[PDB]
Amino acid sequence: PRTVMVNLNIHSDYYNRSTSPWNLHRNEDPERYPSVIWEAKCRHLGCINADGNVDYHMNSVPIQQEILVLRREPPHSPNSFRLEKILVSVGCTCVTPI
């Protein structure tokens, strides 16, 4: 139990040209801070080629990143949390299949 105090008060259109473009999904969880997390979801299974068409010889895959969130502890607590690790998609990349 290393309890610390945190003051919660704090003081893109280029990725549309990507060969593995993605859309943003709003992920809401009332038991978490931040309650709203934007998760990227790849638009296509393949990648956009030179002609602007979807080529299935390449794959758009999401980039999964481990992020820290605050989980309310005990549940529904407005002022006490525990640090937690979750996996979120931050964008998409284009990979050459195996």
E strands in 21-58: 22-28, 32-33, 36-42, 47-48, 54-55
Residue pointed to by tokens 């105090």: 5
Stretch that binds ligand A1JPU, among 9-17, 36-44, 46-54, 71-79 (CB under 6 A): 36-44
| Pair type for strands 32-33 and 22-28 | unpaired
Stretch that binds ligand A1JPU, among 9-17, 34-42, 50-58, 72-80 (CB under 6 A): 34-42
- Round to whole Å and give the CA distance between 64 and 3: 29
**92 contributes a contact to ligand A1JPU by CB under 6 A:** no
Secondary structure (3-state) at 67: strand
**64 contributes a contact to ligand A1JPU by CB under 6 A:** no
Q: Which residues bind a second copy (CB under 8 A)?
A: 1-11, 14-15, 17-20, 33-34, 47-48, 50, 57-58, 61, 63, 65, 67-68, 70, 73, 78-85, 90-98
